[PDB]
Amino acid sequence: NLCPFGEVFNATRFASVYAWNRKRISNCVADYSVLYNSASFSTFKCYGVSPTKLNDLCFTNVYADSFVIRGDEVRQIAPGQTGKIADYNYKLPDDFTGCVIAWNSNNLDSKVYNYLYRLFRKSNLKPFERDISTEIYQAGSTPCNGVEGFNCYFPLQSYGFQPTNGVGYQPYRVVVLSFELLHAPATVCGPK
């Protein structure tokens, strides 16, 4: 009755960050050690809780958010951050209690690519918001009637993932673990 963290991290394919995937984890025993002393990861940033008590704390729900971004943007997956990814694709709340785990995925997601990110939005996203609109972005007062043109752009943009790129441009796979505690019985706990 372990929780299926492997299906998330060891997933064959990952989603684009504008359409980030979320897996809800509940009614299970979570052994975080099979996940956390792998040194495979490049960044392991936690906010408000330490993994060294995770195997031995309890939460109502756990959320695993999966996507792919660039190196320059992994720093934006954090509370109180600003930038294209943090403002238009995936936003963490300032009171975020969780972990952001990112690792280089040049071998798997870089070809001599299919991932996209939102480039245009009139207002920043609220925390844990997911925008999968493909509606033409209206940069002027004239409506666009659904075709690209002057003052009307496609809101999404393709990543240029090539293996020869610098480390900053390489694709990184990112998993965000959020720990949900409310006024309800806890359903995810550690071996303890």
Partner: antibody
Framework: QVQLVESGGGLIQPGGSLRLSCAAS????????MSWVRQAPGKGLEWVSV???????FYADSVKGRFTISRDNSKSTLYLQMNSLRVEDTAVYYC???????????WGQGTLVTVSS | EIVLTQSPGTLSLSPGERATLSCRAS??????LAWYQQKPGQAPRLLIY???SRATGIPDRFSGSGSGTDFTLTISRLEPEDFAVYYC?????????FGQGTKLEIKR
């Protein structure tokens, strides 16, 4: 038709403050990236600052802590506040419409900022 | 920071000839390049974006080519007003940077 017209260049003493304005026409400034790009006399182009469509602001290292980019949606105007100007900041400042923090597809005529005692 | 190097610094050609300007990048930027033209006393005008797509209102004699670290701008059938300073700009990484430019005078 797109129009960008600038205001506020002049002579200012070192350590003083100046505010450049760029009135815009032909697009809604509140849903577009916009930037300030300066050009020293007889030199190349230097990107100074950018405002995102969502309101986020970014600056170059040479002007951070001193320059502030802003926008007025009720006047359709872009502003650049400088506060602590040095003589090395003397340049022609250009207002530019920015296509997603990528390239500048429309430019203003520029205004000249001279910092001298 | 990524430096852009333009060559040659200045070029002189007669009307009706072809001008070929080269921009080389400190690191690869993968077709994330733009070309601007600046006539004396005027603001830069967007000539090329995406290293190969032509901006609106730009005549067909302007062409962009290249990728990775090597880019080329070609102006065919030179007109006495096609003469100005031409700048390459990269938007691979932050901060965005320009080259010093290639000044193109006309031969007569």
């Amino acid at each position: 038709q797109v129009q960008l017209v600038e205001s506020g260049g002049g002579l200012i003493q070192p350590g003083g403050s100046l505010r450049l304005s760029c009135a815009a026409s032909g697009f809604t400034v509140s849903s577009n990236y916009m930037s300030w790009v300066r050009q020293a006399p007889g030199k190349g182009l230097e990107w100074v600052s950018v405002i995102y469509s969502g309101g986020s602001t970014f600056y170059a290292d040479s002007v951070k802590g001193r320059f502030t980019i802003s926008r007025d949606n009720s006047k359709s105007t872009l502003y650049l506040q400088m506060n602590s100007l040095r003589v090395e900041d003397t340049a022609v400042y250009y207002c530019a419409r920015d296509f997603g923090d990528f390239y500048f597809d429309y430019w203003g005529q520029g205004t000249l900022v001279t910092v001298s005692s | 920071e990524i430096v852009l190097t333009q060559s040659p610094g200045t070029l002189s050609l007669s009307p009706g000839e072809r001008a070929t300007l080269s921009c080389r990048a400190s690191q690869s930027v993968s077709s994330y390049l733009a070309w601007y033209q600046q006539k004396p006393g005027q603001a830069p005008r967007l000539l090329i974006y995406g290293a190969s797509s032509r901006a609106t209102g730009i005549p067909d004699r302007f062409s962009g080519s290249g990728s990775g670290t090597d880019f080329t701008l070609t102006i065919s059938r030179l007109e006495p007003e096609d003469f100005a300073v031409y700048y390459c700009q990269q938007y691979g990484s932050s901060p965005r940077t320009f080259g010093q430019g290639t000044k193109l005078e006309i031969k007569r």
